[PDB]
């Protein structure tokens, strides 16, 4: 699918995301991971061949504003650094990464958003089941 480059991630290990999850970015939903990928794609195209003119299209202003207002209120917010996804290890199919929320200058513990990763895992498994039936 879409393979992220070494410089994009701190880890420096190749991360290739399957086209179904990345396809979910094209939906009406405005995300924080999808925005960052759009920035990476714009930067790649710019290197091959301007950010001020495209910033409105690449970035969701409303989502950025709501995240910062969450930040100022000491509420868990998305600061656009870390993103968590559910990855079915055996098949390799994974959910669309979601922002790892941060509160009080510290990333939320896994338990603190347990439901968020619980339901996503269930949804992913459910989809896989349908693929077997289909």
């Amino acid at each position: 699918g879409y393979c992220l480059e070494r410089w994009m991630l701190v880890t420096s290990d190749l991360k290739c995301f399957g086209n179904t999850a990345l396809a979910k970015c094209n939906l009406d939903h405005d995300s924080e991971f999808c925005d960052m990928l759009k920035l990476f794609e714009f930067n790649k195209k710019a290197i091959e061949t301007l950010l001020t003119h495209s910033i409105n299209a690449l970035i969701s202003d409303n989502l950025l504003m709501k995240n910062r207002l969450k930040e100022l209120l000491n509420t868990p917010y998305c600061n656009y650094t870390k993103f968590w996804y559910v990855n079915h290890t055996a098949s390799g199919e994974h959910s669309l990464p979601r922002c790892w929320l941060v509160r009080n200058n510290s990333y939320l513990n896994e338990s603190e958003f347990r439901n968020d990763w619980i339901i996503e895992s269930d949804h992913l498994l459910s989809e896989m089941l349908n693929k077997e039936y289909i």
Binding site: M36, T52, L64
Partner: protein, 187 residues
């Protein structure tokens, strides 16, 4: 991380330095002091501070009336780019030059080698509600909780300074600064 028998929780951390290296960014040292930097290679930064003290007097200092560019000395080689960053900051603050309090800047003959732009955000000087709007904009642009924090004069001072790494770069402040100034270049 073991979500289940077959499911694992996994994360990826983003390095956005290279994407945002050549574009204006901002920081927060404390709820009062913030540094605005155009890009890594710049040796000069702009310091936006919320200060009780008064640095510029109307009688002895210049006023910004459609002539902000004259506040920066002609001899500096980054004069146009500095004025551009100043316009980036003012546009990011949603400043209305027509009606909001007239900014003051340093006299041309000042011995000190920093350009100083002072805005009076005290309730009496400004029209009602201006201090609230400006403080909320400072929180929105720099991540500060100054608006939530509780007659004392209040001022917004933007002075130029040498970039001595006063702050770690934040690409979210960079996104906010870019969104405020959209389709524009330094000038």
């Amino acid at each position: 991380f073991r979500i289940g028998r077959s499911t694992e929780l996994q994360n990826i951390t983003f390095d956005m330095l290279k994407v945002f290296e050549d574009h204006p960014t901002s920081c927060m040292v404390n709820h009062s002091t913030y540094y605005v930097h155009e890009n890594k290679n710049a040796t000069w930064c702009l310091e936006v501070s919320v200060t009780d003290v008064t640095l510029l007097m109307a009688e002895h200092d210049r006023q910004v009336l459609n002539n902000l560019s004259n506040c920066v000395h002609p001899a500096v080689e980054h004069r146009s780019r500095m004025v551009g960053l100043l316009e980036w900051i003012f546009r990011a603050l949603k400043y209305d030059f027509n009606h909001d309090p007239t900014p003051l800047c340093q006299k041309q003959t000042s011995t000190v080698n920093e350009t100083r732009v002072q805005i009076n955000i005290t309730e009496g000087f400004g029209s009602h509600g201006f201090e609230d709007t400006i403080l909320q904009r400072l929180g929105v642009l720099f991540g500060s909780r100054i608006a939530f924090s509780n007659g004392k004069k209040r001022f917004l001072l933007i002075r130029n300074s040498t970039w001595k790494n006063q702050c770690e770069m934040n690409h979210v402040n960079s996104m906010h600064l870019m969104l405020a100034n959209a389709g524009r270049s330094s000038g």
